[PDB]
Amino acid sequence: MKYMITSKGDEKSDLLRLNMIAGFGEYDMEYDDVEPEIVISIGGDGTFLSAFHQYEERLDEIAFIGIHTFYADWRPAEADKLVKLLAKQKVSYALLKTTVKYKEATYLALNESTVKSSGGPFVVDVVINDIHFERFRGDGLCMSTPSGTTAYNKSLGGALMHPSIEAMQLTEMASINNRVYRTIGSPLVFPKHHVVSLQPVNDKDFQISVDHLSILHRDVQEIRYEVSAKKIHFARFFPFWRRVHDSFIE
Amino acid sequence: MKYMITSKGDEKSDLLRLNMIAGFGEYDMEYDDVEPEIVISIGGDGTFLSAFHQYEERLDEIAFIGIHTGFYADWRPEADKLVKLLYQKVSYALLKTTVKYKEATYLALNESTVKSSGGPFVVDVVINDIHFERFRGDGLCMSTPSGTTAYNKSLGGALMHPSIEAMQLTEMASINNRVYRTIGSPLVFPKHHVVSLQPVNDKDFQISVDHLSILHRDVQEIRYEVSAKKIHFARFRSFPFWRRVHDSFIE
Amino acid sequence: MKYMITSKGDEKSDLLRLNMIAGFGEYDMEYDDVEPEIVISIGGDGTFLSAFHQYEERLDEIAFIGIHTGHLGFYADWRPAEADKLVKLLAKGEYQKVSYALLKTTVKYEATYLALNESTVKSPFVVDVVINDIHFERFRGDGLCMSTPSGTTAYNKSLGGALMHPSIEAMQLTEMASINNRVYRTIGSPLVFPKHHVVSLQPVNDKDFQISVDHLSILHRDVQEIRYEVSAKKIHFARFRSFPFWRRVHDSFI
Amino acid sequence: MKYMITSKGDEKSDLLRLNMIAGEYDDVEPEIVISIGGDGTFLSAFHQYEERLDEIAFIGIHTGHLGFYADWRPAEADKLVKLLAYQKVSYALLKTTVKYEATYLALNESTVKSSGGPFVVDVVINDIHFERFRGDGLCMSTPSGTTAYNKSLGGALMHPSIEAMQLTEMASINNRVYRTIGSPLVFPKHHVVSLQPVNDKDFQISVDHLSILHRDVQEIRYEVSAKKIHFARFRSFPFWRRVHDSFIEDLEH
């Protein structure tokens, strides 16, 4: 192997990183931060996203694994058998591309991307595959990956989607939905190659969040959403619906 | 080629049909009520659903086309050169419903729903043989992707582009108190996932498949999964789904 | 005063009924199921609804009391283990009357119904919704539900309605699965109406409707109009304590 | 009578303002306050005259799409100049107290959000804990405010003659840790809803168009105000028609 480990950086988390590196030392396993084929996240789903956002350019040859103190398969007490089996089953999840135009900037998301007004009222035209769909006025829009559907998407009333489905899901944040600004209400699930284009009507300043990161963009001409060609790969040793059950039902 | 046309039965639908067959008489095409290669539906989505359910056993070599006189009917009463046009075949996913007691199976193009016969509806929802929730409410709805714009939408479900191979489960008026608790959210499942509804007290259920509703007694299990079978559409032009949605709900 | 007791019919309730009757015998209390001044329901919110509907025509001359074994519900303040002191308190005639608003449903062909929780209408279901004689929306869907305030905690809640403090005099209209498209544009939101507002449902094509009033659902043929309004009549509760509606909400749902 | 006119400040409103004046002007003690523009303009005039709400009747003209406080069309300004030379209708208001004490009056609503990071609050009704809420925030609306942000959040529309307040959730988290009622809640007069911090004590508190950051808050208290707002009414335009015209269709315009 070539591998590496990220850690949340607290008390318990650093030790497992040291133990596992020491555990991998007994095997044909080489540590490297530059070209890992295996990335191990130790901490939480919040920790996993930083590991993902660190290796956006090597999503093509990396399988990720999470250790939890929805992306973490193992518990800390199972780390040692993880090292051995890992010394000895890849599944891919879809990702979301966000393009902002002003030189265009592009972002990749594992959970979602959201758009709000800079401070005034948020009003944009929603254009799907070059055809106008609605003129939205409200708090904002949230575009989610399938894996992201259990997060903010869920709070906005979106559908929970099995992460094997290649799609992106759009949810409204507080639409006014009156006869001037008539909107669909329902979440919309898009297949690959569909482009959702957000076009401003008056104000051009927007707070755009991509996973944890929120950035103010000035003088936006367009925000474009589509399912990415890139995918994230997990090393698997996965009952999505039971995890849903354990997290929400109880 | 061998074909047939259905009509809702009002004035214009029956009239436009004969206009179409007479036009089909000018070409190498044979009318045939038992073994069509092409089925033309004249009326509305309800008429379309009936046409689909009339030919459920020959879905693999039928291309469907719908004309609407007032989401499945792309064509307007442009009909005659459509005859002249009569090209690519397009496929939509379908929903398999199996009820166990001799088990019965049904195919849906829009959705299947389950309600109690009378009184409280309570069911255990088992996903891939693992218990997920105990649902209490009015009922549950399992929708195809093309069915997502129909009853599913009114229940708060997501609208899905119909090329996505999935099924979507929505709740009807869930009761959410101190020890009935459900996910609330709509759930979208891929192929090969099986959702099993298993009775808790009552065993009689009103089961909906598209426009048909049937009472079943002594139900052991209701099983939902995406069907291996698909329905094929005859497509001639650009009519995109999202514009159809905009046309139906936004305008 | 004159009183009566209904029982859900299980042995524990019938026995509690017999003991209370004997307990009222030590006081100036007369049992009478025909002209009671006090109606005591033993069982559940369902038992209470039947007690309510048994005496709809004497609501101005009754104070109601509910006794429930475990989960109190929203209409029962008393647990059976407190029956003794309730006999004592009720015999003395402390208590104060608190009133809840009710819902009048009028069906025209004309029949009228009183609801304590809600009335619903079902069929294809298509109706014109007319508020205070002005057209408001043309609805297509599964049906409509109009609830009282005390009814907001039941079916109304399951349809997305707001929970309302039962001291507020209103009725609330919720949609059941509106299609809400360009042919049938509807408000979506629950609507809360004061007294003297009239909501009229007028058919457009089919004229037969399944109409529910609390439990009871009746098939009405050839309906010309369904009218909803806050009733002039109220249901009165005999209350001995400060009735904490939000704590019951918490205990039933949280 | 003593009067004055506010304007949104654009072309048509400023001119219509000057034009109506041509048709005693007094900025300090008006008996009639006229708002020209939109509901946002109406809100500014209301908050401009909070200390004389008992001796003012408000009236609004809408310069664009129909509003809920600005009922009058610009083409009627003249029938209004003639009309004004009427009776009062009063709507309930919402009192917000922030304790660390600052108090606010709202005509539409007050919302509470976290400044940054997770919004978690204990919700206390009439001195008794009711729920622990986690989400984006909470909104408490007046009756007339139910047609504004409240509606977008799934709240009920309430006829504004009902004396109440309505609490809605903004993007609630409902999992194994945090369970909330979900449903909107409508409270009568004299009920107090207290939002109490759990960890963070910094909150974005909005009152109508104003949004305010408070550091180290101890408590946010909501109750229906004893104060009322009075609209000068000359003709029949019912609330449900305003609702219909704004959200359903407006066939005649």
Side-chain angles (χ1 to χ4, degrees), chain A residues 178-179 182, chain C residues 129 131 134-138 185 187 191, chain D residues 66 68 147 157 237-252:
Chain A
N178 57 19
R179 63 173 182 83
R182 183 74 74 208
Chain C
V129 177
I131 298 169
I134 306 168
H135 187 17
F136 182 76
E137 79 202 348
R138 177 166 292 188
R185 179 67 68 206
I187 194 60
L191 304 179
Chain D
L66 177 57
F68 280 97
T147 49
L157 309 192
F237 197 37
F239 168 77
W240 296 118
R241 185 173 168 193
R242 273 172 258 155
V243 172
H244 162 96
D245 292 351
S246 175
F247 297 103
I248 304 292
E249 53 177 6
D250 195 339
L251 294 195
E252 55 185 324

Short mmCIF file of all heavy atoms in Angstrom, two decimals, chain A residues 178-179 182, chain C residues 129 131 134-138 185 187 191, chain D residues 66 68 147 157 237-252:
data_model
loop_
_atom_site.label_atom_id
_atom_site.label_comp_id
_atom_site.label_asym_id
_atom_site.label_seq_id
_atom_site.Cartn_x
_atom_site.Cartn_y
_atom_site.Cartn_z
N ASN A 178 -45.44 32.97 -4.65
CA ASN A 178 -46.70 33.66 -4.92
C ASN A 178 -46.85 33.77 -6.43
O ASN A 178 -46.06 33.20 -7.20
CB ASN A 178 -46.75 35.02 -4.22
CG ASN A 178 -45.58 35.95 -4.62
OD1 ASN A 178 -44.91 35.74 -5.65
ND2 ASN A 178 -45.37 36.99 -3.82
N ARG A 179 -47.86 34.51 -6.90
CA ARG A 179 -48.05 34.48 -8.35
C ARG A 179 -46.96 35.25 -9.08
O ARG A 179 -46.71 34.98 -10.26
CB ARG A 179 -49.43 35.00 -8.75
CG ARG A 179 -49.69 36.45 -8.39
CD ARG A 179 -51.03 36.93 -8.98
NE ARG A 179 -51.29 38.34 -8.70
CZ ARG A 179 -50.79 39.35 -9.42
NH1 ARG A 179 -49.95 39.11 -10.41
NH2 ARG A 179 -51.10 40.61 -9.10
N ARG A 182 -43.63 32.30 -8.75
CA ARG A 182 -44.22 30.97 -8.62
C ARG A 182 -43.13 29.92 -8.70
O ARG A 182 -42.33 29.91 -9.66
CB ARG A 182 -45.25 30.69 -9.72
CG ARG A 182 -45.97 29.32 -9.59
CD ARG A 182 -47.01 29.31 -8.45
NE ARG A 182 -48.20 30.09 -8.82
CZ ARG A 182 -49.00 30.72 -7.96
NH1 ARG A 182 -48.72 30.72 -6.67
NH2 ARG A 182 -50.06 31.38 -8.40
N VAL C 129 -63.69 26.42 -3.43
CA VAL C 129 -63.61 26.88 -2.05
C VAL C 129 -64.00 28.34 -2.04
O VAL C 129 -63.23 29.19 -2.51
CB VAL C 129 -62.19 26.74 -1.48
CG1 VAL C 129 -62.15 27.29 -0.08
CG2 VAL C 129 -61.66 25.32 -1.58
N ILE C 131 -64.98 31.64 0.22
CA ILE C 131 -64.87 32.24 1.55
C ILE C 131 -65.72 33.51 1.60
O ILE C 131 -65.54 34.40 0.75
CB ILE C 131 -63.41 32.58 1.88
CG1 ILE C 131 -62.56 31.31 1.89
CG2 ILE C 131 -63.34 33.29 3.20
CD1 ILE C 131 -61.07 31.59 1.94
N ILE C 134 -66.94 34.87 -1.58
CA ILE C 134 -66.01 35.19 -2.66
C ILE C 134 -65.20 33.95 -2.97
O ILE C 134 -64.60 33.35 -2.07
CB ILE C 134 -65.10 36.37 -2.27
CG1 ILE C 134 -65.95 37.57 -1.84
CG2 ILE C 134 -64.06 36.70 -3.42
CD1 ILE C 134 -65.16 38.69 -1.16
N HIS C 135 -65.17 33.57 -4.25
CA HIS C 135 -64.35 32.46 -4.71
C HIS C 135 -62.92 32.67 -4.23
O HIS C 135 -62.36 33.76 -4.38
CB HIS C 135 -64.33 32.42 -6.23
CG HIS C 135 -63.63 31.20 -6.75
ND1 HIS C 135 -63.38 30.12 -5.95
CD2 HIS C 135 -62.83 31.05 -7.83
CE1 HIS C 135 -62.67 29.25 -6.62
NE2 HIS C 135 -62.29 29.80 -7.74
N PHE C 136 -62.31 31.60 -3.69
CA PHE C 136 -60.92 31.67 -3.19
C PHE C 136 -59.97 30.78 -3.99
O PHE C 136 -58.89 31.25 -4.40
CB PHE C 136 -60.85 31.28 -1.70
CG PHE C 136 -59.48 31.39 -1.15
CD1 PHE C 136 -58.95 32.64 -0.86
CD2 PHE C 136 -58.69 30.25 -0.94
CE1 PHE C 136 -57.65 32.78 -0.36
CE2 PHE C 136 -57.38 30.37 -0.42
CZ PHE C 136 -56.87 31.64 -0.12
N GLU C 137 -60.35 29.53 -4.24
CA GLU C 137 -59.50 28.62 -5.00
C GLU C 137 -60.38 27.50 -5.52
O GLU C 137 -61.44 27.21 -4.96
CB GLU C 137 -58.33 28.08 -4.14
CG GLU C 137 -58.74 26.95 -3.20
CD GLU C 137 -57.79 26.74 -1.98
OE1 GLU C 137 -56.67 27.29 -1.92
OE2 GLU C 137 -58.20 26.01 -1.04
N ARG C 138 -59.93 26.86 -6.59
CA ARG C 138 -60.53 25.61 -7.03
C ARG C 138 -59.54 24.50 -6.70
O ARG C 138 -58.45 24.45 -7.28
CB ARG C 138 -60.84 25.59 -8.53
CG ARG C 138 -61.40 24.19 -8.92
CD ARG C 138 -62.04 24.20 -10.28
NE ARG C 138 -63.27 25.00 -10.30
CZ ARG C 138 -64.11 25.05 -11.33
NH1 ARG C 138 -63.88 24.30 -12.42
NH2 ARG C 138 -65.19 25.80 -11.27
N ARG C 185 -55.02 25.77 -8.77
CA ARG C 185 -54.08 26.46 -7.91
C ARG C 185 -54.65 26.65 -6.51
O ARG C 185 -55.70 27.29 -6.34
CB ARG C 185 -53.70 27.81 -8.52
CG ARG C 185 -52.72 28.59 -7.65
CD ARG C 185 -51.35 27.90 -7.58
NE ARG C 185 -50.69 27.96 -8.87
CZ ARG C 185 -49.78 27.08 -9.28
NH1 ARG C 185 -49.39 26.06 -8.48
NH2 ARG C 185 -49.25 27.24 -10.48
N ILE C 187 -53.82 27.30 -2.04
CA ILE C 187 -52.96 28.11 -1.18
C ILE C 187 -51.86 27.25 -0.53
O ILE C 187 -50.80 27.77 -0.16
CB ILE C 187 -53.81 28.86 -0.13
CG1 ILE C 187 -52.99 29.97 0.57
CG2 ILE C 187 -54.45 27.86 0.87
CD1 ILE C 187 -52.43 31.07 -0.36
N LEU C 191 -55.29 27.44 6.78
CA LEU C 191 -55.95 28.72 6.94
C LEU C 191 -56.73 28.72 8.23
O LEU C 191 -57.50 27.78 8.47
CB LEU C 191 -56.93 28.97 5.77
CG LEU C 191 -56.28 28.88 4.43
CD1 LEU C 191 -57.36 29.12 3.42
CD2 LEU C 191 -55.21 30.03 4.40
N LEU D 66 -49.13 43.97 -5.40
CA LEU D 66 -50.00 44.18 -4.25
C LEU D 66 -49.31 43.72 -2.96
O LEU D 66 -48.57 42.73 -2.96
CB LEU D 66 -51.30 43.41 -4.44
CG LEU D 66 -52.31 43.43 -3.31
CD1 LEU D 66 -52.69 44.88 -2.97
CD2 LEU D 66 -53.53 42.59 -3.68
N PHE D 68 -49.72 43.67 1.67
CA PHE D 68 -50.74 43.32 2.67
C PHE D 68 -51.07 44.45 3.61
O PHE D 68 -52.14 44.42 4.22
CB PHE D 68 -50.32 42.07 3.48
CG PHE D 68 -50.58 40.77 2.75
CD1 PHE D 68 -49.56 40.14 2.04
CD2 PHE D 68 -51.85 40.21 2.76
CE1 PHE D 68 -49.82 38.95 1.36
CE2 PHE D 68 -52.11 39.05 2.10
CZ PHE D 68 -51.08 38.41 1.40
N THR D 147 -48.79 36.08 6.66
CA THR D 147 -48.68 36.00 5.20
C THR D 147 -47.27 36.25 4.67
O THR D 147 -47.05 36.15 3.46
CB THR D 147 -49.65 37.00 4.51
OG1 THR D 147 -49.52 38.32 5.09
CG2 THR D 147 -51.12 36.56 4.65
N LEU D 157 -51.86 30.57 7.73
CA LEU D 157 -52.38 31.94 7.58
C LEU D 157 -53.56 32.17 8.54
O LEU D 157 -54.54 31.40 8.54
CB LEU D 157 -52.82 32.21 6.15
CG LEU D 157 -51.82 31.87 5.04
CD1 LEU D 157 -52.27 32.45 3.68
CD2 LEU D 157 -50.44 32.37 5.41
N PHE D 237 -62.12 45.64 1.46
CA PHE D 237 -61.15 44.75 0.82
C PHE D 237 -60.74 43.72 1.86
O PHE D 237 -59.82 43.97 2.67
CB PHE D 237 -59.94 45.51 0.27
CG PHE D 237 -59.12 44.74 -0.73
CD1 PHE D 237 -59.67 43.90 -1.64
CD2 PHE D 237 -57.77 44.84 -0.71
CE1 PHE D 237 -58.85 43.21 -2.52
CE2 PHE D 237 -56.96 44.18 -1.60
CZ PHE D 237 -57.51 43.35 -2.49
N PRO D 238 -61.34 42.54 1.83
CA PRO D 238 -61.10 41.55 2.90
C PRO D 238 -59.73 40.89 2.79
O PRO D 238 -59.06 40.88 1.75
CB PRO D 238 -62.23 40.52 2.69
CG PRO D 238 -63.30 41.22 1.93
CD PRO D 238 -62.58 42.27 1.07
N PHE D 239 -59.28 40.43 3.96
CA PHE D 239 -57.97 39.80 4.10
C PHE D 239 -57.82 38.61 3.17
O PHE D 239 -56.80 38.49 2.47
CB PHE D 239 -57.76 39.40 5.56
CG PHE D 239 -56.59 38.50 5.78
CD1 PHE D 239 -55.30 39.03 5.77
CD2 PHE D 239 -56.78 37.13 6.05
CE1 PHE D 239 -54.22 38.20 6.00
CE2 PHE D 239 -55.70 36.29 6.27
CZ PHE D 239 -54.42 36.83 6.26
N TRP D 240 -58.85 37.75 3.09
CA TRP D 240 -58.75 36.55 2.27
C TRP D 240 -58.67 36.88 0.78
O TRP D 240 -58.04 36.14 0.01
CB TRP D 240 -59.93 35.61 2.54
CG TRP D 240 -59.92 35.11 3.99
CD1 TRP D 240 -60.89 35.32 4.96
CD2 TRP D 240 -58.88 34.38 4.63
NE1 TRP D 240 -60.51 34.73 6.14
CE2 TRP D 240 -59.28 34.16 5.97
CE3 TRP D 240 -57.64 33.88 4.20
CZ2 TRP D 240 -58.48 33.47 6.89
CZ3 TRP D 240 -56.86 33.16 5.10
CH2 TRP D 240 -57.27 32.97 6.45
N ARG D 241 -59.29 37.99 0.38
CA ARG D 241 -59.10 38.45 -1.00
C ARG D 241 -57.67 38.92 -1.21
O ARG D 241 -57.07 38.67 -2.26
CB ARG D 241 -60.07 39.58 -1.32
CG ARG D 241 -60.00 40.03 -2.78
CD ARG D 241 -61.09 41.03 -3.11
NE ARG D 241 -60.83 41.64 -4.42
CZ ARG D 241 -61.46 42.72 -4.86
NH1 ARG D 241 -62.35 43.33 -4.09
NH2 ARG D 241 -61.18 43.20 -6.07
N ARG D 242 -57.10 39.65 -0.25
CA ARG D 242 -55.69 40.01 -0.39
C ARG D 242 -54.85 38.76 -0.53
O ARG D 242 -53.90 38.70 -1.33
CB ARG D 242 -55.21 40.81 0.82
CG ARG D 242 -55.41 42.33 0.81
CD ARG D 242 -55.05 42.94 2.19
NE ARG D 242 -56.27 43.23 2.94
CZ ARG D 242 -56.40 43.30 4.26
NH1 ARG D 242 -55.37 43.06 5.07
NH2 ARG D 242 -57.59 43.59 4.78
N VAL D 243 -55.17 37.74 0.27
CA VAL D 243 -54.45 36.47 0.20
C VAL D 243 -54.58 35.86 -1.18
O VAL D 243 -53.59 35.43 -1.79
CB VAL D 243 -54.94 35.50 1.29
CG1 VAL D 243 -54.31 34.12 1.06
CG2 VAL D 243 -54.62 36.06 2.69
N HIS D 244 -55.82 35.75 -1.67
CA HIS D 244 -56.08 35.20 -2.99
C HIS D 244 -55.33 35.95 -4.09
O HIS D 244 -54.70 35.34 -4.97
CB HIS D 244 -57.59 35.25 -3.26
CG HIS D 244 -57.95 35.11 -4.71
ND1 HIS D 244 -58.31 33.91 -5.28
CD2 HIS D 244 -57.98 36.03 -5.70
CE1 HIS D 244 -58.55 34.09 -6.56
NE2 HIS D 244 -58.36 35.37 -6.84
N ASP D 245 -55.43 37.27 -4.07
CA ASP D 245 -54.82 38.09 -5.12
C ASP D 245 -53.31 37.98 -5.15
O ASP D 245 -52.71 38.11 -6.21
CB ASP D 245 -55.17 39.56 -4.94
CG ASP D 245 -56.62 39.83 -5.17
OD1 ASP D 245 -57.35 38.92 -5.65
OD2 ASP D 245 -57.01 40.98 -4.87
N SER D 246 -52.70 37.78 -3.98
CA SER D 246 -51.24 37.70 -3.88
C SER D 246 -50.72 36.31 -4.21
O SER D 246 -49.67 36.17 -4.86
CB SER D 246 -50.82 38.11 -2.46
OG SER D 246 -49.43 37.97 -2.21
N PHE D 247 -51.46 35.26 -3.84
CA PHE D 247 -50.93 33.91 -3.96
C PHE D 247 -51.65 33.04 -4.96
O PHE D 247 -51.05 32.06 -5.42
CB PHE D 247 -50.98 33.16 -2.61
CG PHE D 247 -50.13 33.77 -1.57
CD1 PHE D 247 -50.70 34.55 -0.55
CD2 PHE D 247 -48.75 33.56 -1.58
CE1 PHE D 247 -49.90 35.13 0.42
CE2 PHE D 247 -47.94 34.13 -0.59
CZ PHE D 247 -48.51 34.92 0.40
N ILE D 248 -52.94 33.29 -5.23
CA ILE D 248 -53.66 32.36 -6.11
C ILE D 248 -53.67 32.88 -7.55
O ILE D 248 -53.03 32.29 -8.42
CB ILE D 248 -55.10 32.11 -5.62
CG1 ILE D 248 -55.07 31.58 -4.16
CG2 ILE D 248 -55.83 31.14 -6.57
CD1 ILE D 248 -54.45 30.17 -4.00
N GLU D 249 -54.33 34.01 -7.79
CA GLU D 249 -54.37 34.64 -9.12
C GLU D 249 -54.98 36.02 -8.96
O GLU D 249 -55.63 36.33 -7.95
CB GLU D 249 -55.16 33.81 -10.14
CG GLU D 249 -56.58 33.46 -9.64
CD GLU D 249 -57.40 32.70 -10.68
OE1 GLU D 249 -56.83 32.33 -11.73
OE2 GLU D 249 -58.61 32.45 -10.43
N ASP D 250 -54.79 36.84 -9.97
CA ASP D 250 -55.31 38.20 -9.94
C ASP D 250 -55.82 38.50 -11.36
O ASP D 250 -55.15 39.17 -12.14
CB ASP D 250 -54.22 39.17 -9.48
CG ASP D 250 -54.75 40.53 -9.09
OD1 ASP D 250 -55.86 40.90 -9.51
OD2 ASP D 250 -54.02 41.23 -8.36
N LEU D 251 -57.00 37.97 -11.68
CA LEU D 251 -57.45 37.95 -13.08
C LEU D 251 -57.70 39.35 -13.64
O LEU D 251 -57.54 39.55 -14.86
CB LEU D 251 -58.71 37.10 -13.23
CG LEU D 251 -58.55 35.61 -12.96
CD1 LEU D 251 -59.73 34.90 -13.48
CD2 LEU D 251 -57.30 35.06 -13.62
N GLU D 252 -58.07 40.33 -12.81
CA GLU D 252 -58.46 41.64 -13.33
C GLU D 252 -57.29 42.59 -13.53
O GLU D 252 -57.49 43.69 -14.08
CB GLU D 252 -59.52 42.29 -12.43
CG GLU D 252 -59.13 42.42 -10.99
CD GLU D 252 -60.26 42.96 -10.14
OE1 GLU D 252 -61.02 43.82 -10.65
OE2 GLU D 252 -60.38 42.52 -8.97
#
